[PDB]
């Protein structure tokens, strides 16, 4: 079966003996890539991560999430030092930490643009689906089934605040947890309204994330590779979503998981197993020989 293979754009399996780059570091999206559909790290994945640590391969999270919500989802692995959060690429790069927890990227959203996005979202009535991200906390204006759905997966609850409090907050992104029935339209509105102002990404299901226009996960990738004197040619990125496109296309070695869209897969060098098929275990096998 093809359940566990990694293939190039011609459908040919990638073989270790044909590689000419040692992979020293792997950057991976969390939900939809490392985590299976149940938001868990599979045992096969965990077993391969243990071996990657024994061999000195670095595994770095690159996510739209804050580090706080990551810790709530995979904390048990973090506590056992099996997955490191530092260094890490959070909020789609806008908050990227080195191993000392210093922000090597800190891309706050301009406050005029914040308020314009806010007023626009109230105008088109998606403000109720908004989760605003400060450095250390998230905020929403009300709770509904869509906010509920976001809390369940994110596993970290926003504080509920009044509308007029937003002006005082220093934010890095906003995430709209949208009903499925208005995703496609709302995405068109935001992209038309804020082109060359803000990144707009459909990252996961009906999530729409807006963050610093000149920042993405790949900017974080470059910073962390730089920190450890690792050429980009010895890095590998894997992902599934729109917010992974820049890091998949920016590295010579990248893997789009099988569950990714055709757009995301096209941006990647290789296509691997789905997130439910232990994608990073097979990546580690193919590229690092376990
Ligand atoms: O809520 C989860 C995120 O939208 C997906 O996270 P990721 O960037 O690690 O795939
Ligand atoms: Mg993802």
Which features characterize this protein?
monomer, 290 residues, alpha/beta, Rossmann fold, Hypothetical Protein, Haloacid Dehalogenase-like Hydrolase, Chain: A, domain 2, 2 domains, 6-stranded mixed sheet, 5-stranded parallel sheet, 14 strands, 32% helix, 20% strand, globular, binds glyceraldehyde-3-phosphate, binds magnesium ion, HAD-SF_hydro_IIB, metal-binding, sugar-phosphatase activity
Largest sheet: 6 strands, mixed
Task: Give the termini distance in whole angstroms.
Answer: 20 Å
Rg from Cα: 19 Å
Give the overall shape.
globular
The hetero compounds bound to this protein are: glyceraldehyde-3-phosphate, magnesium ion
PDB class: unknown function
Keywords: C2 HAD, sugar phosphatase, haloacid-dehalogenase, glyceraldehyde-3-phosphate, unknown function
Assembly: monomeric
Entry title: Crystal structure of PfHAD1 in complex with glyceraldehyde-3-phosphate
